[PDB]
Scaffold this motif. Structure first.
Motif, PDB file in Angstrom:
ATOM      1  N   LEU A   1      -9.699   5.512   0.206  1.00 19.66           N
ATOM      2  CA  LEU A   1      -9.142   6.811  -0.156  1.00 19.66           C
ATOM      3  C   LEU A   1      -8.200   6.684  -1.344  1.00 19.66           C
TER       4      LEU A   1
ATOM      5  N   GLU B   1      -3.447   7.645   9.054  1.00 22.83           N
ATOM      6  CA  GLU B   1      -4.644   6.824   9.151  1.00 22.83           C
ATOM      7  C   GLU B   1      -4.276   5.409   9.577  1.00 22.83           C
TER       8      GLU B   1
ATOM      9  N   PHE C   1      -2.385  15.567   0.518  1.00 17.78           N
ATOM     10  CA  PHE C   1      -1.882  14.204   0.600  1.00 17.78           C
ATOM     11  C   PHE C   1      -1.526  13.841   2.037  1.00 17.78           C
TER      12      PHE C   1
ATOM     13  N   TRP D   1       0.124  20.112 -16.240  1.00 19.41           N
ATOM     14  CA  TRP D   1      -0.943  21.108 -16.306  1.00 19.41           C
ATOM     15  C   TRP D   1      -0.431  22.502 -15.959  1.00 19.41           C
TER      16      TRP D   1
ATOM     17  N   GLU E   1      -9.881   9.952  -9.268  1.00 20.26           N
ATOM     18  CA  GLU E   1      -9.725  11.382  -9.513  1.00 20.26           C
ATOM     19  C   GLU E   1      -8.560  11.656 -10.455  1.00 20.26           C
ATOM     20  N   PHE E   2      -7.434  10.971 -10.246  1.00 22.01           N
ATOM     21  CA  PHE E   2      -6.279  11.151 -11.118  1.00 22.01           C
ATOM     22  C   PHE E   2      -6.600  10.744 -12.549  1.00 22.01           C
TER      23      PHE E   2
ATOM     24  N   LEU F   1       0.325  17.203 -12.605  1.00 24.56           N
ATOM     25  CA  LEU F   1       0.057  18.580 -12.208  1.00 24.56           C
ATOM     26  C   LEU F   1       1.099  19.529 -12.784  1.00 24.56           C
TER      27      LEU F   1
ATOM     28  N   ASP G   1      10.816  11.763   5.572  1.00 26.87           N
ATOM     29  CA  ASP G   1       9.852  10.698   5.322  1.00 26.87           C
ATOM     30  C   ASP G   1       9.841  10.356   3.829  1.00 26.87           C
ATOM     31  N   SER G   2       8.926   9.461   3.445  1.00 26.16           N
ATOM     32  CA  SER G   2       8.927   8.924   2.086  1.00 26.16           C
ATOM     33  C   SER G   2       8.554   9.984   1.056  1.00 26.16           C
ATOM     34  N   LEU G   3       7.630  10.883   1.401  1.00 25.77           N
ATOM     35  CA  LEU G   3       7.242  11.934   0.466  1.00 25.77           C
ATOM     36  C   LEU G   3       8.416  12.850   0.148  1.00 25.77           C
TER      37      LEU G   3
ATOM     38  N   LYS H   1      -2.261  11.278   6.406  1.00 29.22           N
ATOM     39  CA  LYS H   1      -0.961  10.631   6.548  1.00 29.22           C
ATOM     40  C   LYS H   1      -0.973   9.559   7.631  1.00 29.22           C
TER      41      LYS H   1
ATOM     42  N   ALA I   1       0.674  11.985  -9.754  1.00 29.29           N
ATOM     43  CA  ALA I   1      -0.144  13.183  -9.609  1.00 29.29           C
ATOM     44  C   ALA I   1       0.710  14.440  -9.689  1.00 29.29           C
TER      45      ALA I   1
ATOM     46  N   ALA J   1      -8.717   8.457  -4.924  1.00 26.80           N
ATOM     47  CA  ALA J   1      -7.656   9.297  -5.468  1.00 26.80           C
ATOM     48  C   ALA J   1      -7.237   8.830  -6.856  1.00 26.80           C
TER      49      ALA J   1
ATOM     50  N   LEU K   1       2.994   6.068  -2.810  1.00 25.20           N
ATOM     51  CA  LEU K   1       4.062   6.933  -3.313  1.00 25.20           C
ATOM     52  C   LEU K   1       4.018   7.056  -4.833  1.00 25.20           C
TER      53      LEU K   1
ATOM     54  N   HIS L   1       0.828  -1.202   0.000  1.00 24.85           N
ATOM     55  CA  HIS L   1       0.000   0.000   0.000  1.00 24.85           C
ATOM     56  C   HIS L   1       0.864   1.255   0.000  1.00 24.85           C
TER      57      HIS L   1
ATOM     58  N   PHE M   1      -6.527  26.644 -10.986  1.00 23.15           N
ATOM     59  CA  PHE M   1      -6.491  25.347 -11.647  1.00 23.15           C
ATOM     60  C   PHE M   1      -7.910  24.873 -11.915  1.00 23.15           C
TER      61      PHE M   1
HETATM   62  C1  LIG Z   1      -2.721  16.982 -12.105  1.00 18.04           C
HETATM   63  C2  LIG Z   1      -3.797  15.932 -11.823  1.00 18.04           C
HETATM   64  C3  LIG Z   1      -3.471  14.953 -10.673  1.00 18.04           C
HETATM   65  C4  LIG Z   1      -4.569  14.843  -9.581  1.00 18.04           C
HETATM   66  C5  LIG Z   1      -4.994  13.402  -9.184  1.00 18.04           C
HETATM   67  C6  LIG Z   1      -5.438  13.194  -7.702  1.00 18.04           C
HETATM   68  C7  LIG Z   1      -4.292  13.085  -6.645  1.00 18.04           C
HETATM   69  C8  LIG Z   1      -4.668  12.445  -5.270  1.00 18.04           C
HETATM   70  C9  LIG Z   1      -5.409  13.369  -4.246  1.00 18.04           C
HETATM   71  C10 LIG Z   1      -5.411  12.863  -2.767  1.00 18.04           C
HETATM   72  C11 LIG Z   1      -4.608  11.560  -2.485  1.00 18.04           C
HETATM   73  C12 LIG Z   1      -4.768  10.982  -1.074  1.00 18.04           C
HETATM   74  O1  LIG Z   1      -5.281  11.620  -0.195  1.00 18.04           O
HETATM   75  S1  LIG Z   1      -4.152   9.266  -0.733  1.00 18.04           S
HETATM   76  C13 LIG Z   1      -4.441   8.684   1.029  1.00 18.04           C
HETATM   77  C14 LIG Z   1      -3.141   8.666   1.874  1.00 18.04           C
HETATM   78  N1  LIG Z   1      -3.230   7.967   3.170  1.00 18.04           N
HETATM   79  C15 LIG Z   1      -2.443   6.867   3.519  1.00 18.04           C
HETATM   80  O2  LIG Z   1      -1.623   6.458   2.701  1.00 18.04           O
HETATM   81  C16 LIG Z   1      -2.608   6.212   4.888  1.00 18.04           C
HETATM   82  C17 LIG Z   1      -1.418   5.357   5.395  1.00 18.04           C
HETATM   83  N2  LIG Z   1      -0.112   6.013   5.229  1.00 18.04           N
HETATM   84  C18 LIG Z   1       1.049   5.289   4.887  1.00 18.04           C
HETATM   85  O3  LIG Z   1       0.900   4.083   4.742  1.00 18.04           O
HETATM   86  C19 LIG Z   1       2.438   5.973   4.715  1.00 18.04           C
HETATM   87  O4  LIG Z   1       2.532   6.791   5.829  1.00 18.04           O
HETATM   88  C20 LIG Z   1       2.615   6.842   3.433  1.00 18.04           C
HETATM   89  C21 LIG Z   1       1.517   7.891   3.326  1.00 18.04           C
HETATM   90  C22 LIG Z   1       2.575   5.907   2.237  1.00 18.04           C
HETATM   91  C23 LIG Z   1       4.042   7.596   3.449  1.00 18.04           C
HETATM   92  O5  LIG Z   1       5.012   6.728   3.714  1.00 18.04           O
HETATM   93  P1  LIG Z   1       6.719   7.258   4.154  1.00 18.04           P
HETATM   94  O6  LIG Z   1       6.433   8.416   5.081  1.00 18.04           O
HETATM   95  O7  LIG Z   1       7.213   5.987   4.790  1.00 18.04           O
HETATM   96  O8  LIG Z   1       7.337   7.627   2.821  1.00 18.04           O
END
Ligand SMILES: CCCCCCCCCCCC(=O)SCCNC(=O)CCNC(=O)[C@H](O)C(C)(C)COP(=O)(O)O
Ligand SMILES: CCCCCCCCCCCCCCCCCC(=O)OC[C@H](COP(=O)([O-])OCC(O)COP(=O)([O-])OC[C@@H](COC(=O)CCCCCCCCCCCCCCCCC)OC(=O)CCCCCCCCCCCCCCCCC)OC(=O)CCCCCCCCCCCCCCCCC
Ligand SMILES: CCCCCCCCCCCCCCCCCC(=O)OC[C@H](COP(=O)([O-])OCC(O)COP(=O)([O-])OC[C@@H](COC(=O)CCCCCCCCCCCCCCCCC)OC(=O)CCCCCCCCCCCCCCCCC)OC(=O)CCCCCCCCCCCCCCCCC
Ligand SMILES: CCCCCCCCCCCCCCCCCC(=O)OC[C@H](COP(=O)([O-])OCC(O)COP(=O)([O-])OC[C@@H](COC(=O)CCCCCCCCCCCCCCCCC)OC(=O)CCCCCCCCCCCCCCCCC)OC(=O)CCCCCCCCCCCCCCCCC
Ligand SMILES: CCCCCCCCCCCCCCCCC[C@@H](O)O[C@H](CO[C@H](O)CCCCCCCCCCCCCCC)COP(=O)(O)OCC[N+](C)(C)C
Ligand SMILES: CCCCCCCC/C=C/CCCCCCCC(=O)OC[C@H](COP(=O)(O)OCCN)OC(=O)CCCCCCC/C=C/CCCCCCCC
Ligand SMILES: CCCCCCCC/C=C\CCCCCCCC(=O)O[C@H](COC(=O)CCCCCCC/C=C/CCCCCCCC)COP(=O)(O)OCCN
Lengths: 178, 62, 104, 88, 175, 128, 124, 165, 459, 67
Positions: free
Chosen positions: A62, A53, A47, A29, A69-70, A26, D43-45, A51, A22, A66, A16, A11, H127
């Motif tokens: 989610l 959850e 995003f 765009w 949406e992408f 973006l 972090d990963s991001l 973080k 995305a 997402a 990532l 996951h 946007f």
């Molecule tokens: C230009 C057009 C593009 C637009 C398309 C739409 C884009 C998406 C919009 C919103 C996306 C979301 O919310 S996506 C929902 C995000 N939530 C989760 O992932 C919950 C659990 N988190 C984890 O497992 C890790 O902490 C992790 C986050 C992987 C980081 O890992 P590191 O810290 O170890 O790197």
């Protein structure tokens, strides 16, 4: 390209990869750098909103929303690096890549030119021939009876050992062979 | 050696073609056909010495 | 074959195939020099409507414009010698009908 | 002709340049072997953003399967050197 | 020149105008023509003169073969193979000659169309009607014979046309 | 929310839009591991011959031979006369022949009957 | 456009049809009409090889312009007066064609007006 | 160079017994010409750099400069020279309405202005998702998406399944 | 005509008396000399044929075919000697003997004055080809291929024998001159219909006609290189030559007896061109392209116009040369990699540039690029068909498009892309192979300067 | 003319390219102005456009509706 793939993507890896896709779309765009930076920080904030959850089911939902949406909002003509699989120069220099075994078929008059290069090639060939059996033996030793489970290869572990199956990785023609 | 290119790539090829056209191609009927030159009032023919009369005294709305 | 991963280390990179793997019955149709099934940004059966509608609209408008042409408020062009009867094919032994033009 | 051949020193200097232009990294603290997750507390991001910045810097894309394991500047330098056939 | 007969391949008297300059500016075409003359046309003429001098010292002749007129297929009995063969050879020779006649008329038409410029539709009516007449005659003679043609099939086609024409004339006589 | 994307034959469904890859069970993970193991074993078998210094020639691929044999030699032994097969064969075999016969025969009959009327405008047609 | 709007949206029966025009006799409204004349003969145009579409009533100015182009070849900017004369004669011909169009339109409109008006006078 | 031919073409199209739809589409294409020319110039030559940092920009080569210079002199003077050095083969359109004489220039200026406005609006920090018309235009009307996939697939499938097998 | 036949016979004791290491040299040299001698038959009289004697004659149709056969023999010898190196001396001499016997039967077949002698030699050509295919073929399917090739031919040829003896009984002669000069129309009757069928079906199956073509892929793929060369270049033209000779006595029946054959030929040329688009074997694609070209030749012969016969003759010659060159090109790669699959070896242009040039030229001649004689024949046939009916242009254009498509598909698949990694036994091209390709291609281009040599009697 | 990369700085420029570009842009504009001064009719039109409503019925030859 260089790393052995895993049986599946976690996951975290999918999250990532969606983030990177995305961001790239973006940027496609948002042509200008300042506007792209602004909307990229907005994307990063949206995003990071989820973080921490802990419920895996809602995180998966989610992720699916997402991705939908992408796909709906993706750029139909995203920017691609020229050497990338979609770039305008992806396989441009593939016709210039000649395998190294072709040098054995050269005429002796052709090898009269470039003598030192062919002497060093003879050295490399002796090295490969003297290492192959040890490579095979090491691969047989370090492998489970039910065959390999992944595409990973072990390194060398002895004094004068070379990593098994190295000839066709070391002797790549080039990225710009001509 | 200054003008070797202009004598071997231009002068020699035109010598062969001009000889080929003048004595071989034009030795048979209807091989090189030119549309006849335009004639205007007041012109003079080279062969017969004819003079084409002028053209009817415009109303001259000057 | 275009949908396969281009970043994987295939045995045959152009072909995007691995040695010893089962080969699709229609591989030569899908060699990516040919028919591509890759997903599109816009749904199939949505592109079809737009394309068909554009072509049909343009054809219908061209037919309408053929029914309703554009021209200038002028009379037909007038030519001196019986509408150039001798010039447009001749036959000078049949006395063409007098095409007479008058000043205005 | 085209651009001069790339060198290891230039690659490392450019990687350190890009990382020193990053706000979440102390310029003094940063080192070639400085781990991203452990030493810089990232972090990963942030790693994804660093990889994208490297791609923008060198004008070539790094696949996600390989970018996942670039956790120090030296690894990025090695990856770039091996991909563009830079040996000295 | 005089090499080809001017009656089979005629052309108008070739009227050309005289130059009437209107400006003091020098004409570049005339200067280029003089340069071309002095650099190309004189060496070529000298080479041709030498070639003709060498040719004159060795003069020999070739003749046009004449063919007698042998009886045609109409005066050969049904199973006389020799008369049939000679008539068929004569008919094939005549077919080739007719093809060449049509070729000559077509050459005349093409030359007229190129020569007359913008007034070809009016000044090439005589060549057009000549070609129409020859084309109708050649069609009536040889069209629809198909491959494996022969003098016998041409005679059969002619006889069918003659029968149709005679019936039409007879039925018109009663009108 | 946003308009939905529907796949088809020539524009398939993207992986990220596939509900199958987001509804995971342990048996799915086991299947993925088995597939990866098969791929890895085939890759090892290929790479042991690819990197062999001694080996000279073309490394035979059983899969390619199977594909060619199935596409060429194995078709007739697995053919059965079936209403589907019989109807498709009859159609694709003799339908076009009779269609083209009808078209050409009608056109040539019209042309010949129009010739007999003396109205075809065959002027200048001396080559056939 | 205005004529197209009048013809296609309004009563097309009141507007001239460019294909079949003029429908009225050339001497209908005029007491006497002078026949248009030519300055250039058929032979002059045949020898000049102008074109079948350039052999209009403006052909003499075209012949003059082409001759003056031919004599003053190196100076291609010297034939201004001849070009102006040919353009003016073509403009006069175009104005004559516009006059013919307007005459046909007015004649048709007046004919329709007068015949329905005499019908209206006869019905009462 | 483009004046002496393109503007005469527009003038002749305007003054002919022609299809109305064809005339309208020609005018709209005349607008779009200036539109994409403005797009090219605006996105390629104006604004701030967007290329990778290592600058290799160098156009100081005599071959490139000489060749582009020769074609530039051509593009500047060939129209006038060739137009004035050939006999008249088309009857000129001398009498036309003034608004209809200026139609090409009005169309070109409208294209310039509107394309420049829409290009200037991308600097804004706003946007929005693309419209369906934009998707139709960018993907070439979906003509290569359908015509390169459906007929080819059907032809090859019938070539294998029916003709061969 | 004996000045050609007798040296061809002398080729046999000369190769049977040669040393073990000189057979190829001697055979090639004297075959080239015989081809040079046979080149003198192109001087044609126009009006009538060259009647050497009661038994043999030469025509403007026969002479290009004879020259093609005599020229093809040395190319066959050059192509054969590579894969026969391990053979014993006696078996190599037997193979060369088979080739010489085939040449002798072919040269006698094209010059016979009488139809029974033509039939005897035209059947006699079967035995050497069958022996070559079934003895020196590489795979196990050569036996089935030989059975197909023999029985498809004989099932059509036997009724021709019956019809010929019946015709000689009814008319009194089968000499082609007497046949032509004493030609009488065939009435509209069932007996005449079956006589027409018996006179036509043998040449139909030798072309082959679509629907009777199943033997050709088997025989052409399963034969050795020389066998494929002679099958494609010469043996396919026997049917066309027989049709041109035999349709003289079939009028006016051909006017409607040709409808099913025209329909079959047009639709089947479309079908075989389409089939070439999905083929995994490189030789089968060339075989099916041959089928399409011969379908076009069948249409040309059926429509019975002078332009049609001229185009058919030109197309026969051009197709023979091009198909032989393509088969040799495929055989070189097969000798390299020991497999006929097209996608096994890719990107050969990177490794063999001159062979890639030969491939490009052969593919360009296969798609009939102007002003090659292939397009001369094809365009003449297309014009004749258009005169026959204006609707034929749809099928002709479709066939042209598909032909270009699969020709360039084969070229791109075999020569372009990236090379196969594991294949590392691709040696540089030998002088023999390059010389063989050049000797195939140069006469093709030289014939463009003098197209009237191959246009036939109707010229 | 040897020019080297600069890494995030404006590239090195030579005088010749600048003067050539300026000269040719000025040449284009000067040519346009010269043509418009000498051939303004080609853009603005030369002959007047007649107004059909300004035409009397006597010169156009239509009767006054009463005959
Ligand atoms: C230009 C057009 C593009 C637009 C398309 C739409 C884009 C998406 C919009 C919103 C996306 C979301 O919310 S996506 C929902 C995000 N939530 C989760 O992932 C919950 C659990 N988190 C984890 O497992 C890790 O902490 C992790 C986050 C992987 C980081 O890992 P590191 O810290 O170890 O790197
Ligand atoms: C050169 C180019 C290439 C040329 C060559 C290539 C092409 C030609 C050759 C190849 C193609 C031709 C093949 C011929 C058919 C071979 C059949 C066969 O081998 O069966 C063995 C095979 C083995 O036998 P088995 O194992 O004992 O049986 C167990 C069954 O499998 C168990 O099956 P089941 O019990 O489920 O079903 C069986 C049952 C039920 O069957 C079904 O369920 C399906 C329906 C089949 C019959 C009716 C067809 C229905 C759909 C189409 C209807 C007609 C539409 C209109 C056609 C014309 C349009 C203009 O059968 C019926 O009810 C049929 C009753 C008959 C009614 C209709 C009769 C029509 C005759 C032909 C009409 C068309 C003429 C041509 C018109 C052309 C115009 C230009 O039997 C089958 O399985 C097939 C049975 C169905 C056969 C239907 C045939 C239809 C095709 C047309 C036939 C006419 C062509 C042949 C001419 C000579 C005929 C005398
Ligand atoms: C007195 C007479 C004088 C007349 C003067 C003028 C007369 C009025 C002119 C007004 C007409 C058009 C005005 C501009 C249009 C767009 C402006 C706008 O609002 O932008 C927002 C938006 C642009 O999309 P976006 O989401 O902002 O772009 C995303 C990013 O910005 C993506 O950003 P990016 O970075 O990728 O690049 C942005 C790029 C890309 O921007 C775009 O995406 C726009 C692409 C499409 C719009 C271009 C307009 C051309 C329309 C031609 C259609 C011909 C008929 C085709 C029939 C199709 C039937 C289905 O923009 C550009 O660089 C240039 C775009 C075009 C600039 C030049 C346009 C002017 C030419 C058209 C007017 C002609 C003027 C002279 C008149 C000549 C004759 C009198 O436009 C729209 O949403 C709708 C556009 C309207 C198109 C309608 C097509 C006409 C036919 C419709 C069908 C009729 C039948 C009914 C249905 C069928 C029933 C069965
Ligand atoms: C039209 C131009 C006129 C030029 C005048 C002089 C021409 C002399 C050529 C004589 C015939 C060529 C022999 C073909 C075998 C290949 C030779 C070879 O292996 O190269 C070694 C040699 C050594 O190079 P390398 O560095 O060692 O490495 C070479 C690599 O293997 C790889 O090197 P590569 O990739 O460069 O490939 C070699 C080359 C060679 O490959 C070829 O494909 C060349 C052959 C052309 C296509 C052949 C079939 C198409 C049907 C046309 C039939 C025309 C026959 C006319 C009579 C010919 C007399 C023999 O391929 C090409 O260049 C591209 C082929 C595209 C040709 C497109 C032409 C279409 C028709 C044009 C007009 C034809 C009629 C003329 C009159 C028209 C009305 C005025 O390379 C060359 O010398 C190149 C050959 C020159 C190109 C000729 C292309 C046009 C000539 C066509 C026939 C000439 C007509 C003359 C009448 C007057 C005009
Ligand atoms: C896979 C490819 C194989 C090779 C293909 C070979 C093609 C052979 C087909 C032969 C072409 C036509 C044959 C005869 C021409 C006409 C046939 C008949 O249908 O026409 C009518 C004939 O009428 C009836 O139809 C009689 C024929 C009916 C019986 C024939 C059975 C046909 C069924 C199809 C069987 C498939 C045959 C091929 C097997 C492989 C014409 O009416 P009519 O003017 O009065 O008779 C003219 C003859 N006269 C002058 C002697 C009186
Ligand atoms: C009149 C006779 C011809 C009429 C047209 C009939 C249909 C033609 C069918 C041809 C089938 C050939 C299939 C074999 C080709 C091999 C496969 C192949 O070509 O792949 C498709 C290949 C790859 O696609 P890309 O999008 O470019 O990929 C780039 C990124 N990967 O692209 C192609 O070449 C496909 C071309 C298909 C053309 C079919 C559509 C043509 C329709 C024409 C009709 C309009 C007529 C014109 C009217 C003019 C006005 C008088
Ligand atoms: C490998 C596939 C090739 C198949 C080709 C087979 C077709 C061959 C053509 C038919 C063969 C038989 C022809 C007979 C020889 C002709 C001689 C002749 O003309 O004599 C006829 C005799 O005609 C016949 O007897 C013919 C009857 C048919 C006998 C055998 C029938 C077998 C099937 C025939 C149809 C199939 C032929 C075409 C199919 C092509 C392949 C599918 C008339 O003689 P008389 O009796 O004197 O009449 C006049 C005085 N009263």
């Amino acid at each position: 390209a260089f790393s052995a793939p895993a049986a599946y993507l976690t996951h975290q890896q999918k999250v990532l990869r969606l983030y990177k896709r995305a961001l790239r779309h973006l940027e496609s765009w948002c042509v200008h750098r300042d506007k792209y930076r602004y909307f990229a920080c907005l994307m990063r904030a949206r995003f990071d909103e989820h973080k921490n959850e802990k419920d895996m089911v809602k995180a998966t939902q989610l992720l699916r929303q997402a991705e939908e949406e992408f796909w709906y909002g993706q750029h139909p003509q995203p920017y691609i690096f020229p050497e990338s699989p979609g770039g305008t120069s992806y396989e441009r220099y593939e016709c210039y890549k000649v395998p190294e075994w072709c040098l054995d078929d050269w005429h002796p008059s052709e090898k009269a030119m470039y003598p030192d290069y062919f002497a060093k090639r003879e050295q490399w060939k002796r090295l490969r021939r003297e290492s192959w059996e040890r490579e095979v033996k090491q691969l047989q030793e370090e492998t489970p009876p039910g065959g390999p489970r992944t595409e990973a290869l072990p390194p060398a572990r002895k004094e004068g050992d070379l990593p098994p199956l190295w000839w066709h990785i070391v002797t790549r023609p080039r990225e710009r062979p001509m | 050696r200054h003008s070797i290119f202009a004598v071997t790539h231009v002068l020699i090829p035109v010598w062969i073609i001009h000889y080929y056209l003048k004595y071989h191609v034009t030795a048979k009927p209807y091989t090189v056909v030119e549309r006849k030159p335009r004639i205007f009032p007041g012109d003079t023919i080279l062969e017969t010495g004819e003079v084409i009369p002028l053209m009817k005294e415009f109303p001259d709305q000057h | 074959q275009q949908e396969r991963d281009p970043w994987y280390d295939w045995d045959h990179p152009d072909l995007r195939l691995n040695w010893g793997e089962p080969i699709h019955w229609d591989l030569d149709m899908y060699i990516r020099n040919r028919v591509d099934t890759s997903p599109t940004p816009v749904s199939w059966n949505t592109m079809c409507k737009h394309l068909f509608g554009f072509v049909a609209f343009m054809l219908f408008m061209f037919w309408v414009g053929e029914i309703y042409p554009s021209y200038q408020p002028v009379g037909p062009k007038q030519y001196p010698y019986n509408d150039l009867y001798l010039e447009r094919g001749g036959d000078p032994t049949k006395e063409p009908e007098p095409v007479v033009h008058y000043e205005i | 002709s085209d651009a001069p051949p790339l060198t290891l020193e230039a690659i490392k200097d450019r990687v350190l340049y890009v990382l020193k232009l990053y706000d979440k990294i102390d310029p003094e603290k940063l080192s070639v072997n400085s781990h991203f997750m452990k030493d810089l507390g990232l972090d990963s991001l942030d790693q994804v953003e660093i990889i994208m910045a490297m791609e923008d810097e060198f004008g070539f894309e790094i696949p996600d399967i390989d970018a996942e394991k670039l956790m120090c500047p030296q690894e990025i330098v090695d990856y770039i050197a091996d991909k563009k056939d830079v040996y000295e | 020149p005089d090499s080809w007969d001017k009656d089979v391949y005629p052309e108008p008297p070739r009227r050309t105008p005289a130059p009437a300059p209107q400006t003091s500016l020098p004409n570049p075409v005339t200067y280029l023509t003089k340069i071309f003359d002095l650099l190309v046309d004189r060496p070529v003429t000298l080479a041709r003169e030498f070639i003709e001098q060498q040719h004159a010292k060795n003069r020999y002749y070739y003749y046009h073969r004449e063919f007698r007129r042998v009886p045609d297929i109409t005066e050969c009995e049904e199973k006389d193979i020799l008369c049939m063969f000679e008539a068929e050879m004569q008919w094939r020779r005549d077919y080739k000659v007719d093809q060449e006649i049509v070729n000559i008329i077509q050459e005349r038409l093409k030359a007229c169309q190129q020569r007359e410029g913008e007034s070809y539709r009016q000044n090439c009516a005589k060549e057009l009607e000549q070609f129409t007449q020859v084309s109708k005659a050649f069609q009536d003679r040889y069209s629809d014979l198909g491959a494996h043609y022969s003098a016998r099939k041409c005679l059969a086609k002619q006889k069918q046309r003659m029968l149709a024409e005679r019936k039409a004339a007879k039925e018109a006589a009663a009108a | 929310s946003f308009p939905k994307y529907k796949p088809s034959r020539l524009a398939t469904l993207p992986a990220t839009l596939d509900p199958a890859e987001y509804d995971i069970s342990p048996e799915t993970r086991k299947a993925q591991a088995e597939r990866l193991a098969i791929r890895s074993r085939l890759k090892r078998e290929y790479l042991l011959q690819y990197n062999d210094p001694n080996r000279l020639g073309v490394i035979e691929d059983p899969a390619l031979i199977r594909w060619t044999y199935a596409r060429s030699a194995n078709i007739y032994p697995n053919f059965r006369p079936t209403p589907k097969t019989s109807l498709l064969g009859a159609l694709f075999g003799i339908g076009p022949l009779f269609f083209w016969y009808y078209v050409f025969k009608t056109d040539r009959d019209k042309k010949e009957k129009l010739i007999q009327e003396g109205k075809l405008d065959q002027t200048f047609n001396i080559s056939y | 456009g205005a004529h197209l709007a009048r013809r296609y949206l309004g009563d097309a029966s009141k507007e001239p049809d460019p294909l079949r025009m003029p429908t009225f006799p050339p001497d209908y409204g005029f007491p006497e009409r002078k026949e248009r004349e030519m300055v250039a003969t058929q032979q002059e145009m045949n020898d000049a090889q102008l074109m079948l579409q350039q052999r209009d009533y403006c052909a003499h100015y075209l012949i003059q312009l082409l001759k003056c182009k031919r004599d003053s070849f190196p100076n291609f900017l010297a034939c201004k007066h001849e070009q102006h004369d040919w353009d003016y004669c073509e403009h006069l011909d175009y104005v004559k064609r516009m006059k013919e169009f307007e005459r046909e339109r007015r004649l048709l409109q007046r004919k329709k007006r007068r015949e329905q008006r005499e019908a209206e006078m006869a019905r009462g | 160079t483009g004046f002496y031919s393109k503007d005469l073409i527009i003038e002749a199209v305007n003054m002919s017994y022609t299809n109305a739809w064809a005339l309208l589409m020609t005018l709209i294409a005349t607008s779009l010409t200036a539109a994409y020319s403005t797009r090219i110039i605006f996105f390629a030559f104006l604004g701030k750099p967007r290329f990778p940092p290592l600058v290799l920009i160098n156009e100081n080569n005599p071959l490139l400069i000489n060749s582009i210079k020769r074609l530039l002199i051509g593009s500047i003077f060939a129209g006038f020279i060739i137009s004035n050095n050939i006999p008249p083969m088309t009857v000129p359109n001398t009498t036309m309405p003034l608004y209809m004489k200026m139609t090409a220039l009005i169309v070109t200026i409208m294209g310039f202005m509107l394309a420049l406005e829409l290009n200037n609006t991308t600097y804004y920090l706003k946007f929005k998702y693309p419209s369906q018309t934009y998707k139709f235009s960018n993907m070439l009307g979906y003509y290569p998406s359908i015509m390169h996939r459906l007929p080819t697939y059907h032809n090859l499938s019938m070539s294998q399944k029916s003709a061969s097998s | 005509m004996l000045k050609i036949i007798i040296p061809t016979t002398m080729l046999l004791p000369m190769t049977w008396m040669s040393k073990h290491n000189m057979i190829w040299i001697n055979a090639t040299v004297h075959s080239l000399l015989i081809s040079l001698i046979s080149l003198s038959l192109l001087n044609q009289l126009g009006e009538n044929s060259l009647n050497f004697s009661l038994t043999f004659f030469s025509d403007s149709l026969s002479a290009p075919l004879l020259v093609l056969t005599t020229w093809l023999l040395p190319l066959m010898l050059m192509a054969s000697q590579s894969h026969l190196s391990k053979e014993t001396t006696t078996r190599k001499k037997l193979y060369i003997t088979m080739l010489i016997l085939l040449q002798l039967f072919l040269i006698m077949t094209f010059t016979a004055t009488e139809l029974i002698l033509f039939y005897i030699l035209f059947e006699a050509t079967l035995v050497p080809t069958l022996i070559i295919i079934t003895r020196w073929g590489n795979q196990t399917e050569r036996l089935n291929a030989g059975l197909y090739f023999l029985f498809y031919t004989l099932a059509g040829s036997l009724p021709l024998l019956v019809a010929l003896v019946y015709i000689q009984n009814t008319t009194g002669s089968l000499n082609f001159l007497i046949i032509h000069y004493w030609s009488h129309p065939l009435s509209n009757s069932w007996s005449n219909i079956f006589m027409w069928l018996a006179c036509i079906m043998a040449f139909m199956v030798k072309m082959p006609l679509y629907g009777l073509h199943l033997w050709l892929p088997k025989a052409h793929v399963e034969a050795p290189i020389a066998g494929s060369m002679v099958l494609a270049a010469v043996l396919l033209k026997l049917g066309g030559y027989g049709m041109m000779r035999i349709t003289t006595i079939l009028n006016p029946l051909t006017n409607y007896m040709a409808y099913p054959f025209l329909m079959l030929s047009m639709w089947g040329m479309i079908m075989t061109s389409s089939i070439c688009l999905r083929q995994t074997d490189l030789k089968s694609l060339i075989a099916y392209s041959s089928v399409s070209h011969m379908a076009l030749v069948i249409v040309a012969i059926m429509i019975q116009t002078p332009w049609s016969f001229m185009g058919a003759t030109a197309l026969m010659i051009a197709h023979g040369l091009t198909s032989s060159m393509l088969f040799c090109l495929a055989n070189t790669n097969y000798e390299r990699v020991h497999s006929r699959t097209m996608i096994l070896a890719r990107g050969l242009q990177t490794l063999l540039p001159l062979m890639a040039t030969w491939w490009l030229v052969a593919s360009l001649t296969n798609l009939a690029l102007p002003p090659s004689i292939n397009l001369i024949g094809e365009l003449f046939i297309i014009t004749a068909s258009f005169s026959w009916s204006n609707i034929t242009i749809i099928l002709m254009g479709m066939n042209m498009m598909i032909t270009a498509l699969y020709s360039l598909y084969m070229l791109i698949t075999t020569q372009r892309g990236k090379y196969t990694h594991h294949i590392n036994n691709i040696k540089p091209s030998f002088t023999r192979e390059n010389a063989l390709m050049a000797l195939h291609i140069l006469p093709l281009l030289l014939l463009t300067l003098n197209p009237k040599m191959i246009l036939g009697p109707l010229y | 003319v040897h020019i080297e990369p600069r890494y995030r700085q404006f590239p090195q420029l030579t005088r010749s390219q600048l003067i050539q570009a300026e000269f040719f842009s000025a040449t284009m504009w000067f040519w346009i102005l010269w043509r418009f001064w000498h051939d303004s009719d080609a853009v603005l039109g030369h002959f007047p456009y007649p107004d059909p409503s300004q035409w009397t019925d006597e010169e156009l030859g239509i009767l006054p509706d009463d005959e």
